[PDB]
Structures are given as C-alpha cells and as structure tokens.
C-alpha cells in the first residue's frame, strides 16, 4: 500500500558531481528508513562508497553523473506503518557553456536563472546540494567565462555580493567549487543566466 509521490520538475545537472536528497516533510522528519532505486523497484542503489553512483545517508550521489544516467529515480520511504515512494526525473547534460554551446543545458529551468536588481545591492547564489561527506572548497565566480574581479564584487561563502548593480551586470555567469570526497577532488561548475527582469 505504498503511496506514490511525483516530483513536479525534472532536475538538470552537468556531467559532474551531483546529488539529490530524499526528503518528504513531515514524514522524513519522523523515524523512517530511506532507499534509493535506479530504474528498479527490486534492486537498490549500492551503498559502496567507492561506487560512482551510491546512496549516502538519505542522498543519492553521483561522482560524477554521466551520460546514460538520465532517468526516473525512486526513493522508498518506510516508517513503522507508513510507505511512500518518491519519483524524480534526473537528467544529465554533457557540456558546459564556456567550452561549447553544443550538447549542454537542454532548457533554461528556474534553477539556472537568477535576478540582479538594478541600482541596488544584490547577490547571486551558487546552488550546491551535497551530503556532508562532500566537502566544498571556496567558490570562484565567472562572468561570460572570465573570472570576476572588482571592488563591487565580493565572495561571501556561497553568495556573490554585487554592490550597486549596473545595467551591464546582466548576462552569463558561472560559479565553480572544488568538491572533496573520500580523499579525492572533483570539480563542480554551475552556469546561470542573470537578468534584471
């Protein structure tokens, strides 16, 4: 009698480290066990830590996600007397914008769009969702594929602070982080289309 929950939006990722957390409040806030499945209902994702795809606590983790990994993934949440099966579409693309326009981000979802409000002190955010086993280094920021340097621009943890947002602050951005996991380092690169709207 497992109740199926379907995620609204698909999740897009470059071919790089990627993770998705199995969550469903208020159920997962209780005492439940979580099991990830890759196009199956019978054989669970491995928990071998050296496996390219594996479950890490409540997360499914790809180190890295690769072509062929696109699909519907399922998370089965079992409580004492409750069962929920969460469906989510995970889609990988192969290329990054600064390398080529080919085979990259297939559509510009809300997760790849951000807004900088003109004449104000605004910010951009580098969205990095990973299990605690993945340690994120400092974040480098790029504007039209060139490293950002300027007094108006300040790196504060996960955000890029932009003071006195100008008309020319629109365009293509990218944030880059080093991910360290189990003694090995991986690069995470996320693109953003920024506008004033």
């Amino acid at each position: 009698g497992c109740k199926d929950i379907f995620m609204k939006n698909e999740i897009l990722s470059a071919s790089q480290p990627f993770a998705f957390n199995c969550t469903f409040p208020p159920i997962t806030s209780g005492e439940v066990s979580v099991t990830w499945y890759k196009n199956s209902s019978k054989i669970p994702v491995s928990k071998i830590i050296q496996s390219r795809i594996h479950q890490d606590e409540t997360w499914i983790l790809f180190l890295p996600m690769e072509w062929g990994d696109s699909g519907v993934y399922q998370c089965v949440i079992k409580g004492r007397d409750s069962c929920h099966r969460i469906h989510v579409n995970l889609t990988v693309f192969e290329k990054h914008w600064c390398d080529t326009s080919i085979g990259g981000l297939p559509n510009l979802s809300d997760e790849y769009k951000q807004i900088l409000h003109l004449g104000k002190d605004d910010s951009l955010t580098c969205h990095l969702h990973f299990p605690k086993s993945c340690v994120l280094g400092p974040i480098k920021w790029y504007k039209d594929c060139n490293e950002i340097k300027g007094e108006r621009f300040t790196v504060l943890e996960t955000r890029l602070l932009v003071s006195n947002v100008s008309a020319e602050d629109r365009g293509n951005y990218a944030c880059q982080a080093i991910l360290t996991h189990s003694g090995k380092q991986y690069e995470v690169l996320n693109g953003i289309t920024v506008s004033h709207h």
Partner: antibody
Amino acid sequence: QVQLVQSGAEVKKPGASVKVSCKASGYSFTSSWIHWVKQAPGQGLEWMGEINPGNVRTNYNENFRNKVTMTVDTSISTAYMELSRLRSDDTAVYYCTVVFYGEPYFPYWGQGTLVTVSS
Amino acid sequence: QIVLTQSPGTLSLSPGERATMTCTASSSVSSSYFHWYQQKPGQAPRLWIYRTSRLASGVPDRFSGSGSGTDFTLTISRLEPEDAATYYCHQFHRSPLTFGAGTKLEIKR
C-alpha cells in the same frame, strides 16, 4: 529583438581570402555563441563552427579547420568569418546564427551573404 | 559525425492532404537537441520545430514533430499552399552539428 545583419555579397579571385561580417544587436553580445553555416548553391546546410565572444573560444567543424577563421570585434558587436585560399567550392551563401544558454537551437539568423569565387 | 538521413527528398501533394517526412540518425540524439527548419527560396532557414515536438513562434498547429533515439518525424496534418518549402532536420547533440539533406514540399493545385 535579436538581430543579425550581414555584410553584402562579394566576388573574390581563386587563392584570395574573404571576410564576412555579422553585426549583432538586441542582446548581450558576449553572453552567446555565434555560429556560421554554409549553404552551397542547390545544396543543404553545412555547420562550420562556433565562437564565444566572451572568452573568444572557437570550435571549428574540422572540415573547415584550415579554411575558416572566426573572430569578433566586441566593441561594435560584430562577428567575422574569414575564408582563406578560396576555391570554387567555397562559392556559397554564408549565414551567421546566435545561440543562448539553455536554448540549444537556431532561432535567429543573419540574412545570408553570397560569396562567389571567380577570376 | 552524426549523419542525418532525411526522406523523401521531394514531396508532391494536394491541399488538405497529410504530409510526412522522416529523419534517421546514425547515432542516438536526445529529444531536446533535435529540431526542424523551414526554408523558402532566397530566405534564411526559419526555426520551425524545436526539441523534437515544440512549435516555434508563428507555426500553425497543423505541424507536429515526434521521434526518439534515432528516428524522427515531421507531420503536416492538412496542407496549405504556404507550406511549400524545403524542410531540414538538425541535431545539436554532438559536434560537429549536422543537418538532413532536406525535403522539398511541392503543393499540387
């Protein structure tokens, strides 16, 4: 509204070179990839390569590796496509297009430039 | 290179009839990277269908695209005269980008 305006037709002698321009407006020039497309008379469409005016990276169709050189002058929002050592089979209409992040297709085209190679 | 084989090369049909053209790819193309263009003589190609099945701006509902992996199809439900043109398929999946050789649609009257 995105616009691409190309330079006029030209004739050039065999062995010479030609440089076609593509002037852009209606968007942030450095936030895009410019592509060039070849249409030989009566034939279909052949992709030549792409240039990113932001980091000036170029990726050429290797069938045009030693033929084409893509450049930009960002101060006037203009992309250039240069063909070297012209032969007869370089006679064709050339199109520039522009591509945006998350939109991997060609919605905007220049009007085309006919380049004729002749003595 | 991903080669796109487009057929038929020429289509000759009367108004109201159904038009079908196919594109077969030598390697799998993702559905988000497969597109069709319409070109009339003397004019630049116009984006017509993108992402296998989405209509570009100004494109009437009688046009529809479908396909998967290696087999794609453009269908025109009920032909109008303004549909006369050459249609090209296109993949944005893998470098170098490639186009089909085209299907020229002629309208009988």
